Amino acid sequence: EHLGFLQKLYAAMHEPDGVAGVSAIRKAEPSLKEQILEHESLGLLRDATACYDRAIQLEPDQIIHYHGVVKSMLGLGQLSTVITQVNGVHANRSEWTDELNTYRVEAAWKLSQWDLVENYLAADGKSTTWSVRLGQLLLS
Amino acid sequence: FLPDHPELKKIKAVLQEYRDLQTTLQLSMKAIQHENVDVRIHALTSLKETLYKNQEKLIKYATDSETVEPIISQLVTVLLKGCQDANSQARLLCGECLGELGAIDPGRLDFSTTETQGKDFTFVTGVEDSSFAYGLLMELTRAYLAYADNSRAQDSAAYAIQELLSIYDCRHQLWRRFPEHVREILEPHLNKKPIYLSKLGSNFAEWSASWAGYLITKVRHDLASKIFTCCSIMMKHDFKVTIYLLPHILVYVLLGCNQEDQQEVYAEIMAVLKHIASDLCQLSTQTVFSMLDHLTQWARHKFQALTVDYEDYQSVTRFLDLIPQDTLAVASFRSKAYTRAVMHFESFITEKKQNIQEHLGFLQKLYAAMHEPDGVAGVSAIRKAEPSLKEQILEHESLGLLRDATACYDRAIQLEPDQIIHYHGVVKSMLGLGQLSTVITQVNGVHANRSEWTDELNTYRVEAAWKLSQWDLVENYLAADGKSTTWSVRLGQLLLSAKKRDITAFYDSLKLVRAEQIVPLSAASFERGSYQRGYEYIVRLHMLCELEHSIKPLFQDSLNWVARLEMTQNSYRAKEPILALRRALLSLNKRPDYNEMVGECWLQSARVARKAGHHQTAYNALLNAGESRLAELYVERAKWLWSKGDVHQALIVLQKGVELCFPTPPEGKNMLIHGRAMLLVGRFMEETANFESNAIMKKYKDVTACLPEWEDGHFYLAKYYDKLMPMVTDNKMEKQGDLIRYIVLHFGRSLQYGNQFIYQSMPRMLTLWLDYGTKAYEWEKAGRSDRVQMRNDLGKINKVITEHTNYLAPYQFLTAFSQLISRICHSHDEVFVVLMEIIAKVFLAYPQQAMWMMTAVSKSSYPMRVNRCKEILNKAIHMKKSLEKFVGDATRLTDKLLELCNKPSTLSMSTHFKMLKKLVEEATFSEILIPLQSVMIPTLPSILGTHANHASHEPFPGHWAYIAGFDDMVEILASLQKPKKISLKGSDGKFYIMMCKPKDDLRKDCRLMEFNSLINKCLRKDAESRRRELHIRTYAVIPLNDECGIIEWVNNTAGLRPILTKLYKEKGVYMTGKELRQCMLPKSAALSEKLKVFREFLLPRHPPIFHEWFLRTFPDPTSWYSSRSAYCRSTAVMSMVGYILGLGDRHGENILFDSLTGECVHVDFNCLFNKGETFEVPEIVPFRLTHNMVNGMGPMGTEGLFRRACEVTMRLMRDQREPLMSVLKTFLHDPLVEWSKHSKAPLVVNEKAKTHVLDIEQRLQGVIKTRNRVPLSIEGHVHYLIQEATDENLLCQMYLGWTPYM
Amino acid sequence: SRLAELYVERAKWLWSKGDVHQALIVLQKGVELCFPENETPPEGKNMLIHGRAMLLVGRFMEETANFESNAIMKKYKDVTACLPEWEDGHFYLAKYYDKLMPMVTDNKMEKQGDLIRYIVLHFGRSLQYGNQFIYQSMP
Ligand SMILES: Nc1ncnc2c1ncn2[C@@H]1O[C@H](COP(=O)(O)OP(=O)(O)OP(O)(O)=S)[C@@H](O)[C@H]1O
């Protein structure tokens, strides 16, 4: 009963150490999204990629769930892979194409290609975009 | 004549004139061989039915012993004679039967007995030969005969037959040699050049015809001209006939040609090398290679030789000079020559010293073609030049490491995209660990680009859809469906068929899948050892066979997938796919129960993963499944993670899992799993100070309590107690046995259940029992403490022997029966003598084995022992009246053998031993099956059968040869103190000579042979060892005389020094014996001074002949490549195991090479722990490394990837460290072996030898020990050994000994 | 960069991997990467890497069973030789000397002394060159 509040509490803390203690504390191992929250505390990309894949296998109703896999692609930091993830994401997100495009734009900053920059520039997002919006200023 | 009969009575009538399931199988094996191919197809259908009829029972025949079933071996022969049919349908039916059989582990398969690829060489000089003329007659036969059916071809064919008649009379020794028959019916009637390939040459033959007109002018031989004129008309009649004629014609062309014309012909050959009609040009290049093979035959004629014969050799050399080996290699890549191409590449490397990097570029392409297990990496290590990063990515692909650098292949794509194929490799990376989501992302990316590959990726996606087991995914697959199909893609099409419910229409598609398998079968025909090489392709076929059984249920033999898996070989490369195919079958099933059924298969895959590492993949596998939670299953996943690391973290997780599993109740598997978790906890307890050993023992005791039935829990506990026991004295000694007896009793009960690790553990338990018996006697001599307290221990020991007797088995005896010889030599007496009686009971179980041990015992005076052995014989005589009579006949035969062995160019046993020859002829001595070294080794019980498998199993099971005696006149070996070997004719008729040499401690060596073929069996067990296929030869030793043991010698065995001598003779280089005498070495020679003189003398003495030796060793280029694999097997890990033993110091003469398969041989390694090496000169080198032996080893690269692999084998070899230690304990234990050099002491131990045993343990540690300070890496230990081999400093230190210029 | 540079660092990544034998292959590879038989480099930045690589090779050698104490000392002497000025070269050398010193005493304090003085002298020179290993050196 404490744990459901605790999982929310760990997120508010945004502290890995608090999350790790909660995982040890829980009687039942976290699974699916609960497992995914554990993965973020774990900090291991390969485990996260597997967790994202397992979550997708159970269901793929979340753009954010796709985004976490994209974050794993960012951990991989391979430009060809990031583009491959982006192309798959654009078709998959018919409802929200380019939601991870800003993540792709950061990848474009990694790409350091003006033409790659142009595709992101062509994309328009109503988001701060974090560093990537700064990258758009960098793009010209 | 015998055939299956629709009506039983007709079959019965045939059967009575001719004169249970296994016998039927034996008839079936005869049936599998077919006089008529059409007859064979009916037999194949019957055979598939027979396997189905066998059903679960066929699986039972398959599994009974860890050693592969002999009946399976007949079945294995059936596989060799199975799906290899020129008719596609005939091969397919045989393949379907193999699928019902399923796939045996290649390591599991024991059929190395068949001659297989090895055969007497086909090549003959030809044309002069009557048989070569017969081959020309064969050319007239068959396709020329088909031409004869055509009228225009027939008139020319009849003229050709007349020309053959002109060469030899149709009538008559040649006629008697001739087959005649259908040929005999033919015989009575008989009584400027851009042209080649292009333009006029057309499909090879037309080009050949223009060449033939040039050829007749080139060769002036009168016989050659007459044959040529006849040949041209025949060549027009058949292109294939022309090609057969052309190799002989080419040989004539080489013998005679215009010097300018020959240069033009060489230029034409280069032009083809530089360059159905296109296939014909490739075939023509092959024909040119065939001409080169003919040139090799001419070279063989030159070899028989030793002006024109020398001049012809010079002309052949010129023809070789016109040829460029590098050009041949460029042609070879077009050729897809592969191993044949490699042999040409090696020759080019040998011909000219080359920079490795210039060598490396050809090599990297060659490795890619090779698909060598070392592949690119061995070349990369060899290269002194850093690889191109794209080349390195290709090398990573060659490694197929997967995991890390999968991204790196993607990263090269990220830096730039130049290859769609490179992208396709990236897509395989995109598949990664079977991730469906990655595939879903990949499909959209594939969609954005337009490529043929993207559809192929979609096929990969379809396989992902198969993992998905989703009908909608199948619907996505259907749009993808309809494309050229990869074998996996075709499997995806089959998955589409499963959605299809095609049934028989699907079955025809399955037949199409079978045709792809048939292409694998075409690959399968090949040189011996091909079947293990083709096993992985066969496994894909085996998966198809499993699919067909699944399909029949869908359309509507237990065939357990798990039952099949234990028989099936497990491959890091292929086992995961085999598990994946089983997972695909589970996905295919729509059964309701199966909602929880599918995961265990992933978990078993996870167990495979623990062996294969890929731990992240293994975690992925848990993600791949999940649900249907089993506390043990989670615990097992934790255990694999624990093996990777974080054992304490895993142990805490396991403790949580145990609480989750139960609020002990066996609960079927889970309580056993809980005990297993406890065993992991006990290992953790050894790991953790916080864990308490006394608490663990109670926990271990609790685990024993949880299941009385499981031997494995008891065995683990017994091992734990032994660790509790090893320091239980903590050097206290004194009282120890009462606790030890409880452990021994537990060991016996675990043995009674039986264990996978039980045979090694039992050997240890027997050794411990022997140790206790020695210890009690030692206490008894002192009179220290209480004689009664020791007596109570002796009674407990007696109780353990009785417990064994209640549970005692001949199978249970196994190694101990061999050990008993040390047991026989015991001061104690009393109960130990009573234990000996149990050993006598084991002797009763098998007479021949008992006799072999007894014969050694008789030769030692053993006067107290000789009486004790006689008493054991007397007890056996009391036990069986028949047994006593058999023993008496056996003793006389052994005595007769001993007299022959003393033997007080061709020595004839009848001529000097007239009585001995007469006795062999006489049947009056009771008939004795001939001793077999393979027979001596114990048979191994199957892991699968828990109870009575050993009782069913022969203690050693094999067909048994019975000695037929030896020929009255035989060749006798001549050597100083030469052993003389005569091999008795087999009851089957195979005969092996055995040679015995006096004053040799063969029995200590025989244990060393026993210390072998157990590790070799372990290599068969190792998946990696099977992939190496590094089979280890086992010497056969029968030293019944303590002084002399007679050993069969393999045909073609060569002393390494003698083989080297043969190479020196081939060079014709001579080093004066006086000149070697003229060289002088001070015993205290300066190391530098000795090395400089030695190197200079050696280089003149031994320019390497290794390249020459390989070419001489196999005429076939393919044979040479197989030989190269054989060379890699030679020495290598087998040499490493001896170095690991530290006992050997084998002479170079002691090392031997066998011509037929090339085998390194180690014999008479009397030294143990290098006692001989310590004497006189000492060499620390792990193996003798003559540079020419190294030069054969160096190959394309002097450093050996195979040598590194052998080191990998050695690291695998130190997996059963305890088992190795037990073997070491046995070597120390035997009386006949002396740690420090019979009747006088019928019933040698070195403290230094015990230290040496510690050194062997240190070798398992891999600690240098010698090095100051310093911490051991197994890969490093191999590298250090490699460094030691590289150094010539040890060779300079050595005096005489290997003494090798090379 | 033609010099192993980051690739020499990659051998350090191999050290993060922790396989010494792979590192040993890397140690052979690094000497080749600066030159087939590269000397500590004439360029000062290259030289610092070349000495550091020798130091990495020496640490690897100390790990290696197949190492010669005299050979390790020669490499350390070379490391001091490539830069008298660099604190780091002495500090690896100073550490090397201490490991050598415990073995050198061979259980006798009296035999130890002249070797100890040379090591102390290197330590003092290193302390002047830099204080980064100096606190460890000071104890
Ligand atoms: N077929 C074989 N090929 C090669 N070596 C063999 C073969 N059979 C036995 N040997 C070994 O080589 C020896 C052949 O005798 P020689 O070497 O000429 O002289 P020897 O003194 O009788 O034997 P040693 O002990 O080997 S020098 C045998 O004694 C075996 O040790």
Curated annotation (Swiss-Prot), chain A:
Family: Belongs to the PI3/PI4-kinase family. ATM subfamily.
Disease: Seckel syndrome 1: A rare autosomal recessive disorder characterized by proportionate dwarfism of prenatal onset associated with low birth weight, growth retardation, severe microcephaly with a bird-headed like appearance, and intellectual disability. Cutaneous telangiectasia and cancer syndrome, familial: A disease characterized by cutaneous telangiectases in infancy with patchy alopecia over areas of affected skin, thinning of the lateral eyebrows, and mild dental and nail anomalies. Affected individuals are at increased risk of developing oropharyngeal cancer, and other malignancies have been reported as well.
Its job: Serine/threonine protein kinase which activates checkpoint signaling upon genotoxic stresses such as ionizing radiation (IR), ultraviolet light (UV), or DNA replication stalling, thereby acting as a DNA damage sensor. Recognizes the substrate consensus sequence [ST]-Q. Phosphorylates BRCA1, CHEK1, MCM2, RAD17, RBBP8, RPA2, SMC1 and p53/TP53, which collectively inhibit DNA replication and mitosis and promote DNA repair, recombination and apoptosis. Phosphorylates 'Ser-139' of histone variant H2AX at sites of DNA damage, thereby regulating DNA damage response mechanism.
Cellular compartments annotated: Nucleus; Chromosome; Nucleus envelope
Gene designation per UniProt: ATR
Name of this protein: Serine/threonine-protein kinase ATR
Tissue expression pattern: Ubiquitous, with highest expression in testis.
Organism: Homo sapiens
Domain of life (superkingdom): Eukaryota
Post-translational changes noted in the entry: Phosphorylated.
UniProtKB/Swiss-Prot annotation, chain B:
Reported impact of residue 677 to G: In a lung adenocarcinoma sample; somatic mutation
Effect in UniProt of substituting residue 205 to P: In a lung squamous cell carcinoma sample; somatic mutation
Residue numbers spanned by region Catalytic loop: 1142-1150
Quaternary structure, from the entry: Forms a heterodimer with ATRIP, forming the ATR-ATRIP complex. Present in a complex containing ATRIP and RPA-coated single-stranded DNA. Binds to DNA, and to UV-damaged DNA with higher affinity. Interacts with MSH2 and HDAC2. Present in a complex containing CHD4 and HDAC2. Interacts with EEF1E1, the interaction is enhanced by UV irradiation. Interacts with CLSPN and CEP164. Interacts with TELO2 and TTI1. Interacts with BCR-ABL after genotoxic stress. Interacts with UHRF2; this interaction promotes ATR activation.
Protein name: Serine/threonine-protein kinase ATR
Gene name of the encoded protein: ATR
Positions of region (Activation loop): 1162-1186
Domain PI3K/PI4K catalytic as annotated: residue spans: 966-1265
Domain FAT residues, every copy: 327-860
Tissue: Ubiquitous, with highest expression in testis.
Function: Serine/threonine protein kinase which activates checkpoint signaling upon genotoxic stresses such as ionizing radiation (IR), ultraviolet light (UV), or DNA replication stalling, thereby acting as a DNA damage sensor. Recognizes the substrate consensus sequence [ST]-Q. Phosphorylates BRCA1, CHEK1, MCM2, RAD17, RBBP8, RPA2, SMC1 and p53/TP53, which collectively inhibit DNA replication and mitosis and promote DNA repair, recombination and apoptosis. Phosphorylates 'Ser-139' of histone variant H2AX at sites of DNA damage, thereby regulating DNA damage response mechanism.
Residues of the full protein shown: 1254 to 2644 of 2644
Mutagenesis or variant effect for residue 664 to A: Impaired autophosphorylation, leading to decreased activation of ATR
Post-translational modification comment from the UniProt entry: Phosphorylated. Autophosphorylation at Thr-664 in response to DNA damage promotes interaction with TOPBP1 and activation of ATR.
Compartment(s) of residence: Nucleus; Chromosome; Nucleus envelope
Curated annotation (Swiss-Prot), chain C:
Species the sequence originates in: Homo sapiens
Function: Serine/threonine protein kinase which activates checkpoint signaling upon genotoxic stresses such as ionizing radiation (IR), ultraviolet light (UV), or DNA replication stalling, thereby acting as a DNA damage sensor. Recognizes the substrate consensus sequence [ST]-Q. Phosphorylates BRCA1, CHEK1, MCM2, RAD17, RBBP8, RPA2, SMC1 and p53/TP53, which collectively inhibit DNA replication and mitosis and promote DNA repair, recombination and apoptosis. Phosphorylates 'Ser-139' of histone variant H2AX at sites of DNA damage, thereby regulating DNA damage response mechanism.
Designated name of the protein: Serine/threonine-protein kinase ATR
Recorded coiled-coil stretches: none
Tissues expressed in: Ubiquitous, with highest expression in testis.
TM ranges: none
Covered residues, full protein: 1950 to 2088 of 2644
Top-level taxon: Eukaryota
Compartments in which it is found: Nucleus; Chromosome; Nucleus envelope
Complex and partners: Forms a heterodimer with ATRIP, forming the ATR-ATRIP complex. Present in a complex containing ATRIP and RPA-coated single-stranded DNA. Binds to DNA, and to UV-damaged DNA with higher affinity. Interacts with MSH2 and HDAC2. Present in a complex containing CHD4 and HDAC2. Interacts with EEF1E1, the interaction is enhanced by UV irradiation. Interacts with CLSPN and CEP164. Interacts with TELO2 and TTI1. Interacts with BCR-ABL after genotoxic stress. Interacts with UHRF2; this interaction promotes ATR activation.
Post-translational modification Phosphothreonine, affected residues: 40
Family: Belongs to the PI3/PI4-kinase family. ATM subfamily.
Post-translational modification summary for this protein: Phosphorylated. Autophosphorylation at Thr-40 in response to DNA damage promotes interaction with TOPBP1 and activation of ATR.
